[PDB]
Amino acid sequence: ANLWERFCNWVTSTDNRLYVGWFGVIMIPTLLAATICFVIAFIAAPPVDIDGIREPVSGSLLYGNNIITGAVVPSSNAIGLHFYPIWEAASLDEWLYNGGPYQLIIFHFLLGASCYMGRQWELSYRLGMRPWICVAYSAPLASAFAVFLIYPIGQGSFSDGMPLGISGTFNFMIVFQAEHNILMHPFHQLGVAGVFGGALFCAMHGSLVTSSLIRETTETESANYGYKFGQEEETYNIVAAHGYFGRLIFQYASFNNSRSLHFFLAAWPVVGVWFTALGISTMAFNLNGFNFNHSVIDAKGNVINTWADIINRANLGMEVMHERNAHNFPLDLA
């Protein structure tokens, strides 16, 4: 075989301990770059002027943070949506001051994660499986796109992307609630349904299978040794599991079909997370959660407060305090 033929055979080989594939040829370098830059920046990067007002925020461990407070800080509001690679800076010192590592990391990560999804498809094809695991992965990936790219595009600045850190994530969430009332947005409510229900159904399915395990071991041995990798027969009694759950609620509220059951397990959380990703990606264009502020009024015209008005008071506190030195005019329009 010619050199290119041999290289293609190696790239697409199903015998490699980790599959490479053509998506992997892009994924590996980009994810390595993103990872190396993230680790170095998280440990050692100097403070970054996130809001473009010459007030650098310290994100790295060596500059006074711990694991909970540390972060790779988003790029400066002075940069907006401008592309800021290393070679666009006069020096690495300037690049760091303006928060270039954030752009490098998130761009390489988004590209690499897209390729990760494609790689899931590709390996399924090589192994003769059905192809839709990548479709399941599209939900979290869409969420990453929403918080790292779409929201910055809509708001006009990568400085409004989610910071790469724990407390930074909390800051992003609180400001988002102040400016969009995400809690009152149906898509985030669907996301909560998705994740609460995903956890619920995870526990339910695990508990039902575990409760219907067939006896193959003694009390001194872990029941897990009752299953042998690759055995032909099923290891639990789905008929008994259905008898139990159908009597727990009622017969027709319980799956007797394992394929239907596992499809439901896949579908519930995946759809919920799709919708929550769309919630972030649409509030990116300032279509916000429901606003019932002062919706209830009495005969004279007095405002009768509701829990929504209480929420509004909390949101006002957040709004007036966030980015305390950045606003010069009365309205926060982005």
Partner: protein
């Protein structure tokens, strides 16, 4: 509480004479205020110039006094700066600038009276909320 005639009674001119708006008048005034004015004056504040609001006291101290129906109608026909020194129809909605502020084109004398009545009544209902801004939401 109720929207009573006492609440709906407001000053009519500068001499102390008062008028009693009807409930239909007050509701029409609220609707027209939302239609033509709330984009800048939601809740009695002024978005494009927060230093000036629609509180009755502020109107009373304006020159000429604007804390009465006739004063407010005259303002809507020929607006002026707070001290009355400059006419600002070129940058503020009014009948004389209805060509550049189209929403004012079809307003009638009764409509203007209704809007003024709404401006005067609403603080009697809401108190500090009117012209108070986000602090009082």
């Amino acid at each position: 509480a109720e929207l009573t005639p006492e609440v709906l009674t407001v000053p009519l001119n500068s001499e102390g004479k008062t008028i009693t708006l009807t409930e239909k008048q007050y509701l029409e005034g609220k609707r027209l205020f939302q239609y033509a004015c709330a984009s800048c004056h939601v809740g009695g504040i002024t978005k494009t110039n927060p230093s000036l609001d629609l509180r009755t006291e502020t109107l009373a101290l304006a020159t000429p006094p604007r804390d009465n129906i006739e004063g407010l109608v005259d303002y809507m026909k020929n607006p002026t700066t707070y001290d009355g020194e400059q006419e600002i129809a070129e940058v503020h909605p009014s009948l004389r600038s209805a060509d550049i502020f189209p929403k004012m084109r079809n307003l009638t004398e009764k409509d203007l009276v209704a809007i003024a009545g709404h401006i005067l009544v609403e603080p009697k209902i809401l108190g500090d909320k009117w012209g108070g801004g986000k602090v009082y939401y």
